[PDB]
Symmetry: C2
Subunit: 62 residues, 2 copies
């Protein structure tokens, strides 16, 4: 199906990506701070993120 793949970048930058059913990544994160911070971040997603609202701030006249 899909999941959160938690890796660190060459820069030592702990991060996590999320996949899709067609076996493709749709985002990569900053990872927040560290591995412990990475899982804790993903813990937010596990709660109700599939039901969470999607607000767009960047609808700004420029």
């Amino acid at each position: 199906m899909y999941k959160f793949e938690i890796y660190q970048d060459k820069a030592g930058e702990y991060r996590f990506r999320f996949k899709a059913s067609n076996g493709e990544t749709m985002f990569s994160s900053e990872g927040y701070k560290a591995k412990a911070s990475a899982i804790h971040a993903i813990e937010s997603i596990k709660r109700n993120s599939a039901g969470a609202d999607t607000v767009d701030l960047t609808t700004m006249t420029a």
Copy 2:
């Protein structure tokens, strides 16, 4: 409760963050490419991400 705030960075970098019930951000993304790509990414989350698995690659980093 909590939601996805979609903004663009000073670098013109479309991205989205996710909040927590205590009114605090837990990640910021790369936003994938653009606004359309940002929402499409968040669409993956809406599906089953609250039930998605959490796999850590950086225990044996690649």
